[PDB]
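Researcher: Please generate the 3D structure of the following complex. Treat every line as part of one assembly.
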Amino acid sequence: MERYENLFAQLNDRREGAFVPFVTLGDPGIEQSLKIIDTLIDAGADALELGVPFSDPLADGPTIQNANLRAFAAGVTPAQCFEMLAIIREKHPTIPIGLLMYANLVFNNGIDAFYARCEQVGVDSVLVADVPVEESAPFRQAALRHNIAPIFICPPNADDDLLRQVASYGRGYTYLLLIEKLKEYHAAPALQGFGISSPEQVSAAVRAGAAGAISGSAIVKIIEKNLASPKQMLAELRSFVSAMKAASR
Amino acid sequence: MERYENLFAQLNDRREGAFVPFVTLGDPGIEQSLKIIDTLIDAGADALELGVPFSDPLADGPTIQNANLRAFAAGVTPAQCFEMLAIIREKHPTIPIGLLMYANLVFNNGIDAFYARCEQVGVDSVLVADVPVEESAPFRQAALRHNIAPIFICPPNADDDLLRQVASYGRGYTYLLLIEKLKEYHAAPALQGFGISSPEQVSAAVRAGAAGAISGSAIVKIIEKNLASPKQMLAELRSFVSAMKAASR
Amino acid sequence: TTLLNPYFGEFGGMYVPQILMPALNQLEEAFVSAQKDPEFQAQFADLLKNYAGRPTALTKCQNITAGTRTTLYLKREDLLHGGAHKTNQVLGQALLAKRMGKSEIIAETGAGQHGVASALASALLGLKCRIYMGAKDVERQSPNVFRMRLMGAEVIPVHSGSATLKDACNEALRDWSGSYETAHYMLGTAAGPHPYPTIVREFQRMIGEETKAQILDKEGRLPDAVIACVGGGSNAIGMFADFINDTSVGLIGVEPGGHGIETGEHGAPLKHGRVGIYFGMKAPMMQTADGQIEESYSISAGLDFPSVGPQHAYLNSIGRADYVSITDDEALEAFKTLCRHEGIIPALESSHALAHALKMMREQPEKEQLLVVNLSGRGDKDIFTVHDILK
Amino acid sequence: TTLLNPYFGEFGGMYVPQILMPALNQLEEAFVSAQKDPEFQAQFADLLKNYAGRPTALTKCQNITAGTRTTLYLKREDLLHGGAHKTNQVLGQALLAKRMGKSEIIAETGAGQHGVASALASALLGLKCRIYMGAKDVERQSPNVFRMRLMGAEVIPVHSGSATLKDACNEALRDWSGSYETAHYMLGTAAGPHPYPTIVREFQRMIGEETKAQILDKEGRLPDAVIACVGGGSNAIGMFADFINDTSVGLIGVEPGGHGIETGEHGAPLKHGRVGIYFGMKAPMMQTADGQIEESYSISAGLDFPSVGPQHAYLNSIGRADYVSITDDEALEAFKTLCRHEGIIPALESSHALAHALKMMREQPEKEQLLVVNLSGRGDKDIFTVHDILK
Ligand SMILES: *Cc1c(COP(=O)(O)O)cnc(C)c1O
Ligand SMILES: *Cc1c(COP(=O)(O)O)cnc(C)c1O
Ligand code: NA
Ligand code: NA
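Model: Done. Output below.
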């Protein structure tokens, strides 16, 4: 498919930025996670970035580390995440769905098999947190064979060489953590990540030239704060996402 | 004086051996010790060997080590022992009194002063447990100046050279732990020590050619065993000494 | 782009977030530079000699092999300053940090030995040291924790995940991701992302170089085999390195068998794990069927690294090195045996190596063989552990 | 009649019961023989080198003396097998026992270090070892007690007297009185009856010989002073020996000052005791006005010997050596200072020596001086003790 391409074209046709929220699949539970996700979408999320709980997320802060703890406490496994992914895609045919993975869960039962599974459930992209562009060959090749866009992070300490690689190897969107150079090398639309927790940062991202913004932990923080009340959790998630999406317009 | 010389001459004039019991001054108390001693004498002891409690009697077995513990528990000090020695001599003018000392109590306030104190209270001999004949010069010289007989142990592993020295340096009696050679070198009358705990050992000592025997711990064992009853202690001490003395006749 | 090959066959690599690659390239570049710099070599040799106590002894153990045709030597890293081989490479890495103009050190530790080694090197070379240690390990290693603080290091408990070494490993990388400009991550074993496996081996290779020289001096020939325990792989690759091109010399690595391979309670990923991608490298790992990383179990806390250095997995693949395992009980027996017959208290880690040597001897007492066991560390620290088990 | 002079001026001698003199003469004769026997020397050198780890390092401590004109070196006996200098002489005495055809060893210990050293030497050289230890010390040194047993030694508690080192000292002699034919009493310090003060010094003198060679190599001249703690006197006389004829080299012995000389709670008999006759020698002693022997107090259990070697009392009398004292607090500060600035954990015993050196430096920071502190042992064993005191 070309869900990202269709999304960005539609967003551009109305000078709008994309707002992409991140959540951990199965946090704090399978049932509640599915509801959280449906809420994020009803509230205006343009695409989703979903994490699959991993034992050692060496590339995540406390918010995410705790999110995995909650998920594992709920017995969430990669197999269950994929069952969830299938359900989510069956309810929402057009919203781009990107996974944030750790190399081992991808490599475990074979890289090709992982991306084949992604295509089967309808996933659109995959960002492997601990695979630099230097080690990405087998991953992006497998992704492309299965119509999965391989996503790469463009770090702050990046250089021109990394920029050329990321532009050449990525698809769907570039995970920005510069914008002119990326556009210059025809890189996938850039989404601003890291620190997106208020509407002004969304507007600032779009104004900077980015195609949108990703809220890497703010969503998870709202979940963390409303664990005691599932109903208040969804309500606050709706208000937050609604506010963040309006800022992209 | 010449209390040992007078004792041995008198014992010889009746083919009798000497029985010398050892006790620790102040064990288990000053009062009780004085009574114990008077009992030992009334029972037939020919001479006495008295120990002055010392903190580290590295030349004594458990029986004696515990005897010192009891004495120290009673607050017995060298000064008190000398007060006791004076009292004992004032009650018994002729019985030889020998002290078993540790070098430090002798050297502490000056060697000459120690032997001068011995003469003043009426002590007849002094055996310094940790002073071999090799280191005895200042001790025997001081002893002789104050009419105190310096006593030396003639160990089992002794040799001819040691025998000649002990014979030349000792006075009063030789502490045997051989008899022909000692007599050959005109050594002081030999008293058999170590293992004297039954009448037959006394008779065996005299029969061997020794002038007598010393009971180095048997007396202390009787004390140890009757700590609960002072009256039974004296009674048993009397029976034991009486039995040991008769065996020398 | 790298200056050196990041792989040993299919194992190794640099599986870290993009933000950490510059730090690794910078580190690789500094190491290559340092290796060809005689002043760096001389300074490192000076610390090793006059501070750590190198060269260490090569002790012949005659009592233990009496009645057999086995001649056994123990390379005495237990006599190294700090009580283990860990000290060799932290001194080298500390010097590398300074060469890069770094003033702070980040280090990870399980049993605490590496934490203590990082702390002592940091104290000596004027480096601010912060150590990450799994809360579970902090609780069971109070002695080593206090030693670290006594030496001025800042000890930080890790409650995330299983609160053990692997969780300390992630937390260190996280910190380094955003502080590598002024801080150097002093990795504790011959594993992790390139250039660490290479760097640690090179900074531990004097173990084998000394052993070769010593054995030639004393026996006039090379060992039939050199044996070392394998937690992460540093003391083993340290011993093996100089002998790799000596094809007649067997290289034997000993992984902890724990309560027994068949019980699943062990720490032998190289021979009983499964290849995965974690801690910046592709290597054999202790993991669930699903791909989640598990802990390694052993009576010895020092053999807790849930994976193994990529160079060992490679040496095993081509058949140059052989890897076996030793259980808790076999290691306990070797520990008591050394104490009683040679008056040397070995670390429970080292005891695994010794136990395999004892097995080589005992199983074939008439086989003539010249063996060297790398006594990676002393076991005063294990006196309590062993105490409880006995009687 | 003796082959060597049993006295150092008025101090020393052989104040033992007559029954023990043959054992001492026999021992003296064996030692004299061994000293002129190249095979004995070579065998002793071999154990020292290949088993114990000699020569030990001479570490220059630059951080600690920064800002002053003091250059400080630490002779690293903490790196010796066993963690202390004790090991040097027990190996020599063990070899002497064998030379005399003895098969059993009797040893005394307070803090347990000597017990452990006797046990490891006995294990190595096939000797049956029995150690006497004051019940009070047995209770407070469980680690060292287990180490002894792990090494096959038989540990026997002593409840007599104060149940401490001195009481262990008497019990050993008692045993030896009736077993010296097949057993050798391995005395733990440079004290006791002749020939022990002489024997221990000679078997510890490599400390000073190595230090001289090392300092000449590194500085091209001798130290202005060498400093060592004095419990019984072995590590100190070990360091001092080779420098005695070097009149320009100051010899400084440091006795434990405990809670303070004026408090009477100390262990500094040489400078604050009184000459007495005990443990087979005439030497300064901790004793009551009445002549009863008292215990020495110190935060450090290893400096518990209630007297001091006769050669030190002699060196002090003629002014060749100077003796000072260091309190518990001064030693605790030196201990923390070394850990933090040089990454070396010194034994609380050694810390007394270091503390005095620190004082020499700090009191006159502009005084140019080249000092060597004998770091007699490592202080891993003191981690708990120090722990409690702090905060
Ligand atoms: C840390 C340690 C080990 C395990 O680590 P490697 O990197 O596998 O060497 C082995 N022995 C000792 C004594 C250790 O401290
Ligand atoms: C036993 C000990 C001492 C005290 O003994 P000396 O005979 O005075 O040396 C000093 N330092 C260490 C580390 C010790 O173990
Ligand atoms: Na491992
Ligand atoms: Na002393």
